[PDB]
Amino acid sequence: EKLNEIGYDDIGGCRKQLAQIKEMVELPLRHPQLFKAIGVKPPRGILLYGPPGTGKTLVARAVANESGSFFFLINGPEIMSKLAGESESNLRKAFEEAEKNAPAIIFIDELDAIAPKREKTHGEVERRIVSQLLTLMDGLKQRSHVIVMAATNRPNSVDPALRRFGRFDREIEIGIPDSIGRLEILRIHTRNIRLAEDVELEKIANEAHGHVGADLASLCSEAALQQIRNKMNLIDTIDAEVLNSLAVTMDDFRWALGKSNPSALRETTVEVPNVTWDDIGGLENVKRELQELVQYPVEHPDKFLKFGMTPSKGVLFYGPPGCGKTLLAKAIANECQANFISIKGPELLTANVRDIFDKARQAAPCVLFFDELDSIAKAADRVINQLLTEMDGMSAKKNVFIIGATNRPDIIDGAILRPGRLDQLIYIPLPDEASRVNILKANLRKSPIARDVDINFLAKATQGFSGADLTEICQRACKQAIRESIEAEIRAESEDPVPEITRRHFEEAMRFARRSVTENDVRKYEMFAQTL
Amino acid sequence: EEKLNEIGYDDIGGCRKQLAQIKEMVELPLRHPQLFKAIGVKPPRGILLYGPPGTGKTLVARAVANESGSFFFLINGPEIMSKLAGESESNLRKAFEEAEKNAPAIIFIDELDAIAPKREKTHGEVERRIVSQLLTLMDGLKQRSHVIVMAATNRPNSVDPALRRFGRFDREIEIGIPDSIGRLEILRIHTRNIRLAEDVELEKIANEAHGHVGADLASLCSEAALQQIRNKMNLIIDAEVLNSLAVTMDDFRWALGKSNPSALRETTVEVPNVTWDDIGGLENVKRELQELVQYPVEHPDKFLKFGMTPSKGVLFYGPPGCGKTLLAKAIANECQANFISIKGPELLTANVRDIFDKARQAAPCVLFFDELDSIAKAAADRVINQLLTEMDGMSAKKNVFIIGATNRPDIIDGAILRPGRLDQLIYIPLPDEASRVNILKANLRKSPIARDVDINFLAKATQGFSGADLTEICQRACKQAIRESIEAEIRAESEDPVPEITRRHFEEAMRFARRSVTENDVRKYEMFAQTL
């Protein structure tokens, strides 16, 4: 009933992948004439992979319902819970019924349950089931309009034989949703819940980092439970008056979000960052160099082809700590609308390097950032060799730009800086007056500031201060404001006095203002620049 | 049925030497047995075809069977291993019996590793029984019976060692990554039923499709056709639209850009297309390399007459960026000898023996070990001992020349330099005027330079610049050209000004040109030469 009405509007968090799968399945199964005319082979093996709870179990059924095709479902656990022969019989019957009712889609949920890695199987019956699956997969004639889709947590957990060139040759990753995907999921799940007029789902979506569809559903459930808690406890069968006055409020959603333990906080996020140049300032020389390196290839490839010269895909930022190299990488990615992948040294020290580079390849225009590079370059030997091998194997014609940041340029292994891997070095110095002004405005954007506090004088006063120092100054001013508010409220209770951060807060925070970079360190960096 | 029984040597691409070998080896004995029997040639019993997936080794056996007119029986590993305990053995026996009944015949075992994996991988008792039955059947083929058993595996090491003995599987052929000509042949095969436009030059697509196998090229063609469908149908099924479809070159380049080949990491064994002119080179080095490599291959009779076996070990040493790899490629090209390139990081990441065996398979081959200092230096111990053992084990009568390149000649362990291992040390210095002119011309071959630009003056100005420095100068000139062109386009829009790299561009690019090799390093190398 309800299953046969699931469509593209009932799946959220995957809109690019959904368009891919639409082009890849629906059009072949609706107008085969054109595809067979021009000679396009429709796919036969589609493997959807990603973190759990992402809604990839509904994609197959949505495609089947929208394309008008028959749908057959194989649950791995259900097949593997039967006897030695009944599992084989059920797989064969599934494929036969799919062929008899063509066009059709066969969905194998939890393929790793049926066909795990060859070394994870200890008996012969399981190997027989894997071999039966392979034999059935190869037996699908090209003419027969049967598409086999499968879902797994990771593609490495599946038997390597299944990922060959005629069995499962298309792979799609349905990963963690971005902010827009989170908002779509929230709208889908709150369709039957009665929200209050003050509910602004956009802000809940933006603050729900590392949430998947299941996590957001649990968040909505917790918010509704909090609303019931309050109302029913204060109005403790339940009378009809209360049941009609229940509407979730933004306070409930914030309470739920604060106490929510999302299941995907440790997964790499591939998205276009929302950091602009106005939040970092930056020397105009750096902006020009980074645009020439990361934007001209992506926006004007025709001119590079015309002059016949391949751009370099490597940059090394070096400079005092806290000067904002990560923000610069994010900003250059944002300008070109390219994805951003951030990897820290500690994460690498904790195989995987190839996975990161493959993920970068999948996102065609991507800025891959290796923060704290000195910890990897001069366990260290293995990771450094793997990184060198991967960088050498990255085609210069593919738009994957590698940026590494190091605070100790003199200790980095020379092999990293050899031409072809990371040949270009950029020096990020301490911010100048305008850059400090922009940094200060960026930090204070979200806070209520007094109409007399002038950011220009604070910038003029702060010289030799890194971005971290300015952030600390702002934090200290806000802490003083909060203390004053607490004290004023307590005194009023004993008998808003502080509506915004005044000037006294700022010159009291600036009393203990310590520059974190000494002139000796700046001279050391300048000397390293001169030697270059 | 008819389609399968009508595929021949013209429907397989990417393997033209191996097909000739298999043709001589199988088809002639099975067509004119009397001649081979009279002379005393024993036709082979076991042919094992190995290589990366997607190459086309699955169709080779059928092509041989169809062109020779011999009966063909197919055995699928997954299909045999998906049956019950006794049914698998019954099927193998029936296959061999039917092959013997109808002779001559060819038995193809696809995925032999499925039936006969390494004994360690096998755990059960039925699997070992299947392997033993296969061995017994193979040994039961009388020399008179005209049955040839071909098999296919990804890597021969994955097969049970017992099968690779004499009399069971004694012939081994490798169907590796296709070269440019093979890629063009595959593209022609796959584009037979696709309407191509008049601007489609498949040769360029073949040349730029590095790391592709037959399946990858098929997917590339499919993506190009799908892009054509997108472009035409997005505005727009009407008959005129269907008849007005023709894949264009832009679609092919889009597909190539978005393609992720599956064989990007496999070693390539081919004759490089780098000539002496591209590198420049000194007459002394060219003459020495000719004596060392070309003379043994082209004139072995004279070496036999004078009765002195040639040494086959060279160590190039010189400042970085001087073009040692290009020298190795050029010497390989002149003699039409294959080229295998191994980098130190790849080795650091059992495989040494495989590399040397692969070199041995290619009769004239130049085995190049770049960055030798990483391995050999006064993990490391194991690799260096394996390298020394394999080098001592190479007969001086086989044409496998080993060239190693090092930027730090004084760190190499003396064992590598002992006579009989790498005994000819050659010094590649910084290029002179003519070499610099050649380097500059080679770098600017693919870009439109202006008529006023004179490479002779550019070479005169640049002295002490390594090859990398000249390449960087050309890169900077091109980058300035791109910047000027983009700015001119923007100014025109606001309302081809730069169709060539002018001389102001080179003058500006040479402002920051910095020599990468100090005179101290050159003197250090000269001192090492004197001590030698």
Author numbering:
A (entry chain D): 193 to 428, 433 to 546, 554 to 581, 593 to 709, 722 to 758
B (entry chain C): 192 to 427, 434 to 546, 554 to 582, 593 to 709, 722 to 758
Quote the study that presented this structure, word for word:
As a proof-of-principle in the utility of our prioritization scheme, we conducted further studies with a schistosome protein encoding a putative valosin-containing protein/p97 (vcp/p97/cdc48) ortholog (Smp_018240). p97 is an abundant AAA-ATPase that serves a major part in the regulation of protein quality control, including mediating the degradation of ubiquitinated proteins via the endoplasmic reticulum associated degradation (ERAD) pathway. p97 is a pivotal constituent of the UPS that extracts and disassembles its substrates from various cellular compartments. To further our ability to conduct target-based drug discovery, we obtained a structure of S. mansoni p97 using cryo-EM. Cys519 is positioned within a flexible “P- loop” of the Walker A motif (GxxxGKT) in the D2 domain of p97, which appears to be broadly conserved across multicellular eukaryotes, but not certain unicellular organisms such as yeast (S. cerevisiae).
